[PDB]
Amino acid sequence: SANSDAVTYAKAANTRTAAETGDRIEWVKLSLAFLPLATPVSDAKVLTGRQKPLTEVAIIIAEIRSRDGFEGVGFSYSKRAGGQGIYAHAKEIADNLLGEDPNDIDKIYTKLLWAGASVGRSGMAVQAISPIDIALWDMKAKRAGLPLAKLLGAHRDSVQCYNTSGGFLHTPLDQVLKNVVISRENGIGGIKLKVGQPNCAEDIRRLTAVREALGDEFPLMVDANQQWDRETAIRMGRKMEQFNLIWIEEPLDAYDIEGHAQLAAALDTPIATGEMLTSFREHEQLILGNASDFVQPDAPRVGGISPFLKIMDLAAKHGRKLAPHFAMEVHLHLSAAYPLEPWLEHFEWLNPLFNEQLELRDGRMWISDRHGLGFTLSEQARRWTQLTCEFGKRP
Amino acid sequence: SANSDAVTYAKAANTRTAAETGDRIEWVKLSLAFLPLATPVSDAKVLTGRQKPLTEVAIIIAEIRSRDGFEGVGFSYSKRAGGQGIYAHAKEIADNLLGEDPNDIDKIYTKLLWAGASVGRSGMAVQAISPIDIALWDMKAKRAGLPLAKLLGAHRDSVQCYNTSGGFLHTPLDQVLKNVVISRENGIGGIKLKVGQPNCAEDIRRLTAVREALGDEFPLMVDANQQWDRETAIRMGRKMEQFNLIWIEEPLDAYDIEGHAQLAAALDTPIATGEMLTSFREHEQLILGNASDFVQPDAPRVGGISPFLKIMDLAAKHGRKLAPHFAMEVHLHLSAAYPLEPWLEHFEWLNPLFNEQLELRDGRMWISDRHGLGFTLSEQARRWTQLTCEFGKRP
Numbered sequence: 139s140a141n142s143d144a145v146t147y148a149k150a151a152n153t154r155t156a157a158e159t160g161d162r163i164e165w166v167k168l169s170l171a172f173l174p175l176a177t178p179v180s181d182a183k184v185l186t187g188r189q190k191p192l193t194e195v196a197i198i199i200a201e202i203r204s205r206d207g208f209e210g211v212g213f214s215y216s217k218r219a220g221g222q223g224i225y226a227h228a229k230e231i232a233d234n235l236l237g238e239d240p241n242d243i244d245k246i247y248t249k250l251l252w253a254g255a256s257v258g259r260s261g262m263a264v265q266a267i268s269p270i271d272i273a274l275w276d277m278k279a280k281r282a283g284l285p286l287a288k289l290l291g292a293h294r295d296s297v298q299c300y301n302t303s304g305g306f307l308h309t310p311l312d313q314v315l316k317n318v319v320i321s322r323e324n325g326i327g328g329i330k331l332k333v334g335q336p337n338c339a340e341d342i343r344r345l346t347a348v349r350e351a352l353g354d355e356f357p358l359m360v361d362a363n364q365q366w367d368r369e370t371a372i373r374m375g376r377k378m379e380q381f382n383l384i385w386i387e388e389p390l391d392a393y394d395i396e397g398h399a400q401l402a403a404a405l406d407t408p409i410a411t412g413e414m415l416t417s418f419r420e421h422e423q424l425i426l427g428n429a430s431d432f433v434q435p436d437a438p439r440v441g442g443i444s445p446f447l448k449i450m451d452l453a454a455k456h457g458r459k460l461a462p463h464f465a466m467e468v469h470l471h472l473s474a475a476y477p478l479e480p481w482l483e484h485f486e487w488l489n490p491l492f493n494e495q496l497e498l499r500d501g502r503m504w505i506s507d508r509h510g511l512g513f514t515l516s517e518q519a520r521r522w523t524q525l526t527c528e529f530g531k532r533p
Numbered sequence: 534s535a536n537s538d539a540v541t542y543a544k545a546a547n548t549r550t551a552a553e554t555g556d557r558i559e560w561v562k563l564s565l566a567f568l569p570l571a572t573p574v575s576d577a578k579v580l581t582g583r584q585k586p587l588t589e590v591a592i593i594i595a596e597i598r599s600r601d602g603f604e605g606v607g608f609s610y611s612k613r614a615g616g617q618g619i620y621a622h623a624k625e626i627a628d629n630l631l632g633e634d635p636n637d638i639d640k641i642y643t644k645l646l647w648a649g650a651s652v653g654r655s656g657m658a659v660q661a662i663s664p665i666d667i668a669l670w671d672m673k674a675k676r677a678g679l680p681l682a683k684l685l686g687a688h689r690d691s692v693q694c695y696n697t698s699g700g701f702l703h704t705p706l707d708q709v710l711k712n713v714v715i716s717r718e719n720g721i722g723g724i725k726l727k728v729g730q731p732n733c734a735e736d737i738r739r740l741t742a743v744r745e746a747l748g749d750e751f752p753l754m755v756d757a758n759q760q761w762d763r764e765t766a767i768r769m770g771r772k773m774e775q776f777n778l779i780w781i782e783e784p785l786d787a788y789d790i791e792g793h794a795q796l797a798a799a800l801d802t803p804i805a806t807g808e809m810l811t812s813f814r815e816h817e818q819l820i821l822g823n824a825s826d827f828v829q830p831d832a833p834r835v836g837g838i839s840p841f842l843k844i845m846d847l848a849a850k851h852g853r854k855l856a857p858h859f860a861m862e863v864h865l866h867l868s869a870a871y872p873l874e875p876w877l878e879h880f881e882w883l884n885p886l887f888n889e890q891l892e893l894r895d896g897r898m899w900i901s902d903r904h905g906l907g908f909t910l911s912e913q914a915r916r917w918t919q920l921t922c923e924f925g926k927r928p
């Protein structure tokens with residue numbers, strides 16, 4: 139009988155609990171490696187004097203192994219100063235992972251934030267948690283025998299991909315046009331050109347040439363890397379309407395919410411921003427402020443996959459498109475899980491860190507059948523490792 | 534080298550894709566069963582004449598089997614009219630599942646909504662998707678070899694649990710006091726008393742008696758099931774402050790947002806509501822309107838686990854507590870995944886449907902080590918099945 143005049147209670151023949159049987163983390167290895175860039179890279183931030191050319195990329199890696207035989211790998215990074223701090227903090231909190239059930243990712247995240255409460259819930263501290271958070275997701279996906287995108291649930295099996303590495307400002311227009319061809323012949327689905335240099339006319343010149351070379355249809359976008367003031371932004375915006383760009387990225391300071399909102403409302407061309415934000419909170423302020431048509435989160439930068447998922451849902455709720463920044467090795471899976479058609483950003487910079495390469499074809503990057511992130515650390519990654527530490531004992 | 538003066542592209546040694554290797558749904562079985570209630574149940578909705586006593590519960594079950602050998606089970610229900618419609622719609626859209634990768638839960642959900650676009654994105658139609666959505670989550674958890682709570686990521690391994698079945702209005706005060714003892718001796722962590730009958734004084738009498746019997750500390754809550762108007766709600770609210778209730782539930786019409794908000798702001802006692810809502814959208818309107826301190830979603834009612842997860846995140850963002858309604862067999866896992874300390878509602882009604890029983894001890898319900906939802910359909914569930922249909926072919 140379902141019920142009676144009183145109340146009755148069913149008893150559990152098997153009281154074996156999830157707590158007593160769950161897996162446990164027993165080993166963790168952190169690494170700080172540096173990805174050398176033979177060709178110094180300069181976007182508008184360098185041409186305006188805000189920064190020096192980029193010559194390397196810091197990569198902070200986390201490897202986690204569980205008692206029951208599972209392993210996860212993940213990473214965060216830093217372009218310019220930040221890598222030493224991310225690694226150092228990760229090192230100071232990593233031992234908190236030992237003995238935890240690796241499936242309780244959020245519970246662990248919270249424990250790590252408390253262990254470092256003094257240093258906040260945004261910025262560097264969460265970027266130190268990113269490698270760990272990502273490794274745990276990588277592990278859970280593997281535990282299920284699924285590529286990460288499938289563990290999250292995918293809406294597509296491949297995502298539109300555009301290249302950024304071939305459109306930097308240290309590159310002469312001549313070489314940029316050559317890059318467009320190389321990229322296009324390799325199946326790229328779009329081209330992003332860096333703009334925002336002091337000489338506005340020169341950017342217009344380079345942009346018109348690229349559109350000319352690509353033809354009217356090919357997806358083309360520009361990126362100012364925060365280098366314009368409001369006056370210049372709207373001026374350049376008006377003048378670029380003719381190129382039918384997929385979007386204008388970071389026209390203003392990453393924190394100029396009303397400035398972005400204003401440009402977005404004034405132009406038909408989509409506005410994109412967010413790569414520099416370092417937390418859900420920060421992205422939330424921009425989204426509530428209607429700053430852009432395209433939201434561009436960066437899992438490593440915002441604290442990992444866990445917060446990135448929350449940002450995705452917020453963006454979707456506000457009807458925005460998603461175009462994650464950098465780290466395609468991770469973002470491929472996240473954007474594959476986004477409800478609206480997204481874009482993936484391509485750089486070849488991290489290719490040497492892994493043994494496996496992603497398939498770029500017919501303008502899209504395809505999700506392989508490999509589990510989790512679908513990557514294994516290369517020997518080169520070990521060679522480029524400068525600092526490393528371990529906790530626990532390999533199972 | 535990470536980069537060069539031009540741009541280069543890595544090639545994929547293994548282009549095997551996630552699309553070509555993914556699992557596939559090959560069989561689906563739907564059932565409409567009826568859970569008989571020997572003792573007709575009456576809450577305030579019956580005493581005010583809005584409805585007739587509850588004598589049974591409709592249970593709509595979905596069973597899904599994949600090519601690679603995985604299976605998932607899930608269900609939704611209806612108290613009073615609704616079961617026939619939920620089953621009928623589920624039956625009319627179920628064949629859309631055949632050939633789909635069961636891991637793309639959201640992609641599938643969207644396909645099902647489109648197949649039934651004419652009937653909306655809330656209400657009965659999504660309640661027909663609930664059994665399916667839940668079965669797919671059950672399957673994914675099993676695929677990972679984890680209880681559902683662990684697949685989602687848990688914050689606790691057990692959750693505070695209170696009983697509701699022993700505090701209904703068709704039950705004489707004498708028997709209610711006996712029920713309190715039975716429940717307390719069986720390890721219940723709290724008691725909920727139904728109120729909201731025309732005779733306000735009688736409810737106060739019953740409530741004072743229960744508090745008296747329980748002692749000052751024991752968690753006690755009340756539920757009006759929408760039966761008070763605003764005037765009476767605040768009046769009863771003021772008078773119940775003395776009982777230090779964990780919450781006052783559904784004091785007003787489920788859609789009286791400002792009414793609830795007003796009561797919540799006027800009383801220190803928490804206000805709880807939401808069980809009757811049938812979608813994320815509906816819950817969103819109440820949360821944005823600050824209707825209650827406790828958000829009470831119902832996975833079956835809102836369209837399944839997928840939408841329920843979105844509701845959880847919204848609630849958390851607004852700093853609200855979670856107290857899911859009914860279906861503890863499913864809600865145990867969801868509330869275990871909630872960041873703030875939640876409450877689980879107990880009814881023994883569904884116990885006969887499954888072979889396994891949940892462990893209630895020391896005021897909390899413990900998550901077993903069983904995978905997915907951790908339940909298998911009983912022979913009794915088959916005996917109570919009135920209609921059934923199948924699609925595809927058992928693997």
Ligand SMILES: O=C(O)[C@H](O)[C@@H](O)[C@@H](O)C(=O)NO
Nearest residue numbers: 179180181192217302463464
């Ligand atoms: O040179 C840099 O600072 C980076 O490569 C930067 O331009 C890049 O992260 C970016 O903004 N791409 O969208």
Ligand SMILES: O=C(O)[C@H](O)[C@@H](O)[C@@H](O)C(=O)NO
Nearest residue numbers: 574575576587612697858859
């Ligand atoms: O009798 C009913 O309508 C139900 O049992 C209802 O009271 C129950 O779903 C509820 O509101 N419990 O919290």
Ligand SMILES: [Mg+2]
Nearest residue numbers: 361387388413
């Ligand atoms: Mg950029």
Ligand SMILES: [Mg+2]
Nearest residue numbers: 756782783808
């Ligand atoms: Mg209720």
